[PDB]
Design an enzyme around this catalytic site. Structure first.
Site, PDB file in Angstrom:
ATOM      1  N   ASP A 159      -4.163   0.057  55.661  1.00 38.33           N
ATOM      2  CA  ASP A 159      -3.053   0.188  54.923  1.00 38.33           C
ATOM      3  C   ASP A 159      -2.845   1.365  56.178  1.00 38.33           C
ATOM      4  O   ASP A 159      -2.322   2.043  55.600  1.00 38.33           O
ATOM      5  CB  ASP A 159      -2.244   0.772  53.775  1.00 38.33           C
ATOM      6  CG  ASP A 159      -1.553   0.587  52.474  1.00 38.33           C
ATOM      7  OD1 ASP A 159      -0.722   0.458  53.747  1.00 38.33           O
ATOM      8  OD2 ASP A 159      -1.719   0.018  51.792  1.00 38.33           O
ATOM      9  N   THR A 160      -1.460   0.791  57.057  1.00 37.03           N
ATOM     10  CA  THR A 160      -0.640   1.600  57.401  1.00 37.03           C
ATOM     11  C   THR A 160       0.591   2.747  56.440  1.00 37.03           C
ATOM     12  O   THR A 160       0.692   3.852  57.134  1.00 37.03           O
ATOM     13  CB  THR A 160       0.137   1.482  58.617  1.00 37.03           C
ATOM     14  OG1 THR A 160       0.973   0.183  58.194  1.00 37.03           O
ATOM     15  CG2 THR A 160      -0.694   0.723  59.468  1.00 37.03           C
ATOM     16  N   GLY A 161       1.026   2.064  55.706  1.00 37.29           N
ATOM     17  CA  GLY A 161       2.235   2.759  54.726  1.00 37.29           C
ATOM     18  C   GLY A 161       1.241   3.606  54.285  1.00 37.29           C
ATOM     19  O   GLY A 161       1.645   3.653  52.788  1.00 37.29           O
TER      20      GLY A 161
HETATM   21  C1  1IN Z   1      -1.208   4.264  49.292  1.00 35.19           C
HETATM   22  C2  1IN Z   1      -0.811   5.939  48.760  1.00 35.19           C
HETATM   23  C3  1IN Z   1      -0.956   7.164  48.894  1.00 35.19           C
HETATM   24  C4  1IN Z   1      -0.058   8.082  48.805  1.00 35.19           C
HETATM   25  C5  1IN Z   1       1.178   7.077  49.662  1.00 35.19           C
HETATM   26  O1  1IN Z   1       1.077   7.070  50.966  1.00 35.19           O
HETATM   27  C6  1IN Z   1       0.845   5.870  49.033  1.00 35.19           C
HETATM   28  N1  1IN Z   1       1.463   4.927  50.022  1.00 35.19           N
HETATM   29  C7  1IN Z   1       1.682   3.685  49.362  1.00 35.19           C
HETATM   30  O2  1IN Z   1       1.676   3.516  47.780  1.00 35.19           O
HETATM   31  C8  1IN Z   1       3.253   2.251  50.322  1.00 35.19           C
HETATM   32  C9  1IN Z   1       4.574   2.949  49.590  1.00 35.19           C
HETATM   33  C10 1IN Z   1       4.715   4.450  50.204  1.00 35.19           C
HETATM   34  C11 1IN Z   1       4.537   5.231  50.909  1.00 35.19           C
HETATM   35  C12 1IN Z   1       4.974   6.605  51.192  1.00 35.19           C
HETATM   36  C13 1IN Z   1       5.920   7.238  50.166  1.00 35.19           C
HETATM   37  C14 1IN Z   1       5.567   6.771  48.857  1.00 35.19           C
HETATM   38  C15 1IN Z   1       5.250   5.110  48.621  1.00 35.19           C
HETATM   39  C16 1IN Z   1       2.178   1.149  49.650  1.00 35.19           C
HETATM   40  C17 1IN Z   1       1.347   0.471  49.649  1.00 35.19           C
HETATM   41  O3  1IN Z   1       0.806   1.010  51.185  1.00 35.19           O
HETATM   42  C18 1IN Z   1       1.492  -0.800  50.040  1.00 35.19           C
HETATM   43  N2  1IN Z   1      -0.155  -1.141  48.862  1.00 35.19           N
HETATM   44  C19 1IN Z   1      -0.379  -1.125  48.955  1.00 35.19           C
HETATM   45  C20 1IN Z   1      -1.834  -1.637  47.292  1.00 35.19           C
HETATM   46  N3  1IN Z   1      -1.453  -2.651  47.083  1.00 35.19           N
HETATM   47  C21 1IN Z   1      -1.618  -3.426  46.763  1.00 35.19           C
HETATM   48  O4  1IN Z   1      -2.714  -3.664  46.820  1.00 35.19           O
HETATM   49  C22 1IN Z   1      -1.192  -4.403  45.468  1.00 35.19           C
HETATM   50  C23 1IN Z   1      -1.814  -5.551  44.617  1.00 35.19           C
HETATM   51  C24 1IN Z   1      -1.414  -6.241  43.830  1.00 35.19           C
HETATM   52  C25 1IN Z   1      -2.075  -7.176  42.659  1.00 35.19           C
HETATM   53  C26 1IN Z   1      -1.579  -7.610  42.051  1.00 35.19           C
HETATM   54  C27 1IN Z   1       0.008  -7.878  41.334  1.00 35.19           C
HETATM   55  N4  1IN Z   1       0.520  -7.037  42.543  1.00 35.19           N
HETATM   56  C28 1IN Z   1      -0.225  -6.470  43.248  1.00 35.19           C
HETATM   57  C29 1IN Z   1       0.140  -2.471  46.515  1.00 35.19           C
HETATM   58  C30 1IN Z   1       0.921  -2.518  48.137  1.00 35.19           C
HETATM   59  C31 1IN Z   1       2.894  -2.255  47.733  1.00 35.19           C
HETATM   60  O5  1IN Z   1       3.167  -1.245  47.498  1.00 35.19           O
HETATM   61  N5  1IN Z   1       2.921  -3.208  47.454  1.00 35.19           N
HETATM   62  C32 1IN Z   1       4.444  -3.380  47.105  1.00 35.19           C
HETATM   63  C33 1IN Z   1       5.322  -5.291  47.434  1.00 35.19           C
HETATM   64  C34 1IN Z   1       5.250  -3.023  46.162  1.00 35.19           C
HETATM   65  C35 1IN Z   1       5.919  -2.651  47.997  1.00 35.19           C
END
Ligand code: 1IN
EC number: 3.4.23.16
Lengths: 99, 99
Positions: A25-27
């Site tokens: 996850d780069t985000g």
């Molecule tokens: C990782 C955290 C630590 C501190 C932050 O860095 C934080 N980052 C994030 O959460 C970032 C967003 C962010 C970055 C910066 C500031 C604020 C917010 C999103 C993340 O990279 C992607 N993320 C991974 C886990 N996911 C899954 O497994 C989905 C599985 C699943 C199962 C059943 C039904 N549905 C889904 C959800 C998915 C997600 O967000 N997808 C969508 C379509 C919603 C965008």
């Protein structure tokens, strides 16, 4: 390796002698793993995702082998959808985005 | 270009004349943008993540310009804290993960 994004980027990691699937996850700023027992103490953390904040426990200096690449850093354990590898460990293994 | 992960992978995108800052996220299946007006019909979708689910509006076949590169796809518009460019459009600009 070069990983395309047509499919979800799930790699195999090794933590505590166990194997698990994790998301590159780069985000994600931090690495967040599912509920598990790690050694040492833990400090408290509040991380915010798409649906708001959750409370996680941070463990420091944990050895985690991602695709045959060792990395030692901060790992957060909490109620996450999947095991997430964030930029803190992605930089350790030398990960970049190219286009 | 090659984007390192020391800092957050943010880039400028052009959608509907507006230039917005967006995060290149390999962990996101879909592309989600902050509340805005897009032409056409939309469908209510519920997407989840860290923190829970959020209700978004689904717009199909929308053109976005990621660093000059054009991409056509579905973009969800809702209460997201950051503009996310997910795997659906990442593949379109030939985005790849290397290490
Ligand atoms: C990782 C955290 C630590 C501190 C932050 O860095 C934080 N980052 C994030 O959460 C970032 C967003 C962010 C970055 C910066 C500031 C604020 C917010 C999103 C993340 O990279 C992607 N993320 C991974 C886990 N996911 C899954 O497994 C989905 C599985 C699943 C199962 C059943 C039904 N549905 C889904 C959800 C998915 C997600 O967000 N997808 C969508 C379509 C919603 C965008």
């Amino acid at each position: 390796p070069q990983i395309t994004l047509w499919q979800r980027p799930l790699v195999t990691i090794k933590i505590g002698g166990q194997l698990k699937e994790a998301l590159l996850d780069t985000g994600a700023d931090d690495t967040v793993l599912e509920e598990m027992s790690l050694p040492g103490r833990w400090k408290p953390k509040m991380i915010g995702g798409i649906g708001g904040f959750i409370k996680v426990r941070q463990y420091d200096q944990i050895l985690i082998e991602i695709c045959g690449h060792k990395a030692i850093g901060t790992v957060l354990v909490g109620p996450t959808p999947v095991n997430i590898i964030g930029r803190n460990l992605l930089t350790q293994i030398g990960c970049t985005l190219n286009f």
